[PDB]
Design a protein around this ligand. Structure first.
Ligand SMILES: [Zn+2]
Ligand SMILES: [Zn+2]
Ligand SMILES: [Zn+2]
Lengths: 89, 513
């Protein structure tokens, strides 16, 4: 051949049990809003009801984990204390 | 000459009252002379020039500054009358420097001039004012005044620190590097809107760590230490996050080298360098697209995915193209090219069959839009006499039916020639600026809510505007208070009983969870 690849340096991202398509706290969907929002709108204050991303790389509706921090505080899918780093998606 | 002659008058009056007159009357003499002469002429000098304060500041005769400092120290309110004029001059120089006219200016030269003017101001302060507190606070407020302007001042500061951290070509030794870094963080001290600063600093970290390594390998510790000592442990945590990701993915690279020596099935894993990062620290570039993969990289990615699903179960990987690089071994000698995960698919399609066009690479490739056109231009448009992908219809704009060819270009005096069309002159186009502004706005809107729900659970309640003052004071060193935004956002959480904060029942807030 005329051009042959010798080296490569991809960077491979990874996702834990985020289950893209369901939230582990309320079980609704990665979208479709949450249990504390019901319909997509239903007074969602300009769609502020967004997804929250932990350091453990799990994902839930911001609302569903926020309310889980008024009772527990250690991420239900492992044991890590859980942080609030990345947001949205 | 006025300062010298008035000093001579002061000295001669001192000895006159000490010998001819009674030395006990020294007080009222100082009174009359000092009071009248200096106070009346304070106005006349704040008003003049011709080798005056605003002229000696730009000329740089430090002896005059020291003389007037030691003279005006006796007259009351004189230090204020000179602080106001020097602050006016500094604000003029600032708004002349931070001017947005003349698009295309070099940002590193801009911040270099800013550092130069602040350094000459600080040296004139230390030599004349002897590290005075009033002058220091006035220049501090002056720096806080006009540095807030521009939606790009922290962005330009981040670009400057990136240019200074990528390679220490200028100032090979460590002393001047240390001094320039201290001056940089001092300049950053008198700057607001730290959120965009941290965002662009993290973006520059991602740009400098996901590229060719061995930039400094030691200055990262100094950078994180200065960040800890300057802003505090709040974003430096995410910084440690990123660096840890890096070193851990280096250990993962050695681990995968072992696991690849474990099978060696197909000729696709000749030389592999795969990096494993987390989304919690590294955000998506544009869309994380799903373009095709060349066959040997296909086999390499398949082997890596099988390994990561067999011995690292509990998580699945996602494929993308907007990150990384490669070394394309071309072949009178064998010169190895370089492709940054963008030209691999097009060059592979050319290897499979030459004489293609835009339709061929847009039909049988499942190619996105923006990055596709970007890479097309990077390879055939705006190229110096090192063209690796030529075409017959020579034109600036991109057509559809244009055949692509290849040229030798023996000007490469080595075997490792790279096409670094990416990371060009800092343009900061409107779409990327708007999207990062929206991102940082959402970040602020989430951080204010996090802060309010972390704080007001252990504090008292507000009636109309009591706790908003506290939530703005806690964020004073972060960014602007944005009264309208916070007022619109605090009334959105009322949807449920949790911290109702009802505008009707503002008498007692629910101290529950
Ligand atoms: Zn949920
Ligand atoms: Zn919700
Ligand atoms: Zn978790």
């Amino acid at each position: 051949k005329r051009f042959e690849v010798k080296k490569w340096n991809a960077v491979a991202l990874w996702a834990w049990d985020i289950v893209v398509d369901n939230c582990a706290i309320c079980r609704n969907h990665i979208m479709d809003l949450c249990i504390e929002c019901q319909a997509n709108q239903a007074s969602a204050t300009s769609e502020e009801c967004t997804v929250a991303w932990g350091v453990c790389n799990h994902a839930f509706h911001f609302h569903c984990i926020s309310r889980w921090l008024k009772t527990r505080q250690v991420c239900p899918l492992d044991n890590r204390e859980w942080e609030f780093q990345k947001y949205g998606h | 000459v006025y300062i010298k002659k008035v000093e001579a008058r002061i000295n001669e009056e001192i000895e006159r009252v000490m010998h001819c007159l009674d030395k006990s009357t020294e007080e009222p003499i100082v009174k009359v002379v000092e009071r009248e002469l200096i106070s009346k002429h304070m106005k006349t000098i704040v008003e003049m020039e011709n080798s005056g304060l605003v002229h000696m500041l730009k000329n740089g005769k430090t002896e005059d500054l020291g003389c007037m400092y030691k003279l005006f120290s006796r007259v009351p309110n004189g230090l204020k009358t000179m602080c106001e004029c020097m602050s006016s001059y500094l604000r003029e120089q600032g708004k002349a420097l931070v001017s947005e006219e003349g698009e295309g200016k070099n940002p590193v030269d801009y911040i270099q001039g800013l550092l130069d003017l602040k350094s000459r101001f600080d040296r004139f302060l230390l030599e004349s004012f002897n590290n005075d507190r009033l002058f220091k606070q006035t220049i501090a407020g002056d720096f806080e005044y006009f540095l807030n302007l521009n939606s790009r001042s922290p962005e330009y500061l981040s670009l400057f620190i990136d240019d200074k951290l990528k390679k220490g070509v200028k100032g090979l030794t460590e002393q001047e590097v240390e001094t320039i870094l201290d001056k940089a963080m001092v300049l950053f001290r008198f700057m607001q809107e730290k959120d965009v600063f941290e965002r662009y600093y993290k973006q520059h970290l991602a740009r400098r760590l996901l590229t060719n390594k061995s930039v400094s390998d030691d200055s990262e510790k100094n950078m994180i230490s200065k960040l800890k000592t300057e802003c505090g442990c709040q974003f430096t945590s995410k910084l440690e996050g990123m660096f840890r990701d890096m070193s851990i993915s280096n250990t993962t690279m050695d681990e995968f080298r072992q696991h690849l020596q474990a099978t060696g099935v197909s000729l696709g894993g000749v030389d592999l360098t795969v990096r494993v990062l987390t989304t919690g620290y590294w955000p998506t570039q544009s869309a994380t697209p799903k373009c095709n993969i060349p066959p040997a990289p296909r086999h390499a990615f398949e082997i890596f995915r099988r390994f990561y699903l067999a011995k690292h179960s509990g998580r699945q990987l996602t494929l993308q193209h907007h990150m990384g690089s490669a070394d394309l071994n071309a072949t009178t000698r064998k010169h190895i090219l370089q492709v940054s995960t963008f030209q691999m698919t097009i060059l592979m399609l050319f290897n499979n069959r030459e004489k293609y066009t835009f339709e061929e690479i847009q039909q049988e490739t499942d190619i996105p839009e923006r990055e596709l056109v970007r890479a097309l231009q990077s390879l055939a448009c705006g190229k110096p006499t090192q063209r690796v992908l030529t075409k017959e219809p020579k034109s600036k704009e991109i057509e559809n039916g244009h055949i692509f060819t290849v040229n030798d270009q023996f000007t490469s005096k080595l075997h490792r020639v790279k096409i670094q069309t990416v990371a060009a002159k800092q343009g900061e186009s409107d779409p990327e600026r708007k999207e990062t502004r929206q991102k940082v706005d959402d970040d602020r809107k989430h951080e204010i809510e996090a802060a309010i729900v972390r704080i007001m659970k252990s504090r008292k309640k507000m009636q109309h505007n009591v706790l908003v003052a506290e939530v703005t004071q806690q964020l004073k060193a972060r960014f602007l208070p944005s009264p309208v935004v916070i007022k619109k956002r605090i009334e959105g959480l009322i949807e449920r009983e949790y911290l109702a904060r009802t505008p009707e029942d503002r008498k007692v807030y629910t101290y529950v969870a």
